[model samples]
Target: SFSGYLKLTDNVYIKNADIVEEAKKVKPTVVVNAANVYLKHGGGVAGALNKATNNAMQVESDDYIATNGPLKVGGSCVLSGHNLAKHCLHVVGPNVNKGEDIQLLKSAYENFNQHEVLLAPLLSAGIFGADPIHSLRVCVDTVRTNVYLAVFDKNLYDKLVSSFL
Candidate 1:
């Protein structure tokens, strides 16, 4: 079910919606992939996007790094393909046991500030591992130029609603 909405800034908001469905409606300028430093797309959100584009997403990301080299934590790699949005901002979030890494999320959000509409999953809340509300709050604080966060998690959506409202 869709959760409530919370506006962090005039242009930035958090709203509950499955990203795949929301993408069809919004056609966001960027869709963030909670990626690894190595740029693996075999699982999680990156995997879903790769599957959605029939490996085109992975190919584009791979090709980009083949020349540009891999990004470290707090870094990002931009990609494009036939998948979801106009661009994929590949951000390496917190690793297991390193959940305190809010700097990475901040950097990722900062890089995509030029985008009008951007969709992001609850970053590092899955296998990458981070405190959901803590990490999410960092995003809410960091988001400046974006228009919305088409969030996918029910709990995260609820948290954003409760905290910001």
Candidate 2:
């Protein structure tokens, strides 16, 4: 697998790899879903994970919403990873049409769990229409130093990994 990694601080590290390929291999504490406010797993990161989990991921997400209600933008919810990982953290990134609040994007990152290893995707940079570079920066800036980050897009990964060189 084509992969690269970098350390931002003593504990904070980031890696670039295909998330579906890596999640099973790395077995992070949790994998993240670039979720909608409604928390559906229709496409993008959500769809990939749902497919990876054989459709169980989306069903599980439905259960989460049934119990927890619709997740508001900028917040998150955690649930079973359904064999993909130990857990899954679903974060609601701000939609560009909704004003694209940078602070809210930061808040989404801030809501991440304290798992030592966290695998994430570029939030809102897909169908949600956020600037991929900016969303990547938000993850870097907002997450506390310690949770190892695994990002899953080649282009965005190149942007992040190249910045150090």
Candidate 3:
């Protein structure tokens, strides 16, 4: 259950059929989550779905936490200035159009490999006509170098065979 992954700050619980009462119990300094975090997955600071006016998700706490980031409302993942999350991060899966935004992926890798807590929001590609997988390809292809000289690595050959396969 997701409850296992969540970390509540203080004595708090969803009240009995009371939205305001439930909200009063919730107070957080920061809330980080995956891009795929939806209404069912616990939306924001209050852990309340549909609580955000912008539809971006809400955090019901006196301290302000960032949910919508530099990636625009519906852009790629943006993981800057979110390392200070008092709560756990809610990460979403990769996008299908990953091939198109190779640079962004590389930047993402740079941040993550450094052990930084960054926010990543995926593309709403299913409805936006964006292919996340395609964007992923772009990311991988744009890597600074194929430094992995492992002979068993077949990715290079696979790239060559992509046209025929």
Candidate 4:
């Protein structure tokens, strides 16, 4: 029951079955036929969260997932992580710039873990080049989410997680 126009992106490939399943939905939300490279989060934190929830159905299991930049050789693809039932899907198309890159990274992080509460630190970790503690602080404060890390630099991921409380 799609009323809007059908859109597609460069280098993004989709299975006909997947498209058919999606098309069958009664009232579908924003179907991201395009890669994240083209989308911007001008609405900020709240809008970001809503977008995450809207696509939450894509990952409805205890699966760890991620989305990388779109590719042309094999086309845009999705992969699931072996450890922790994690999945990684490269969704942001290749042409994405920094601002869109940041939002796409965060959106991908939200879709990574199974729990919604653990969304923040994953985002902080993704934006590594930024100031760690500040990244963690702002991201956590922005989303009020918790995250755990394995190992990272002194002022990097470790400190970012430590600054949680």
| Residue 60 local lDDT, model 3 | 27
Prediction 2 global C-alpha lDDT: 0.75
TM-score of 2: 0.84
Local distance difference test, per candidate? 0.70, 0.75, 0.28, 0.30
TM-score per candidate: 0.82, 0.84, 0.25, 0.31
Q: 1 or 4, which is superior by lDDT? A: 1
Ranking by lDDT: 2, 1, 4, 3
**2 or 3: which has the higher TM-score?**
2
Per-residue lDDT of candidate 3, residues 1-165 (tens digit): 002111111211111122222222332222223343232334322233224323333332111224433232222232222223333333333333443333333443332222222222222223223444443343234323211111111452244224321
Candidate achieving higher lDDT, 2 or 4? 2
lDDT of 4 at 32: 23
lDDT by residue for model 4 (15-107), tens? 112221332342222222222322232232212322444544334211322344323311223433222113323233222333333333434
CA lDDT for candidate 4: 0.30
Residue 72 lDDT in candidate 4: 37
A best-first ranking of the candidates according to their TM-score comes to 2, 1, 4, 3
- The superposed Cα distance between candidate 3 and the true structure at residue 80, in angstroms, equals 15
Q: How many backbone clashes are present in model 2?
A: 0
Clashes of each: 0, 0, 32, 10
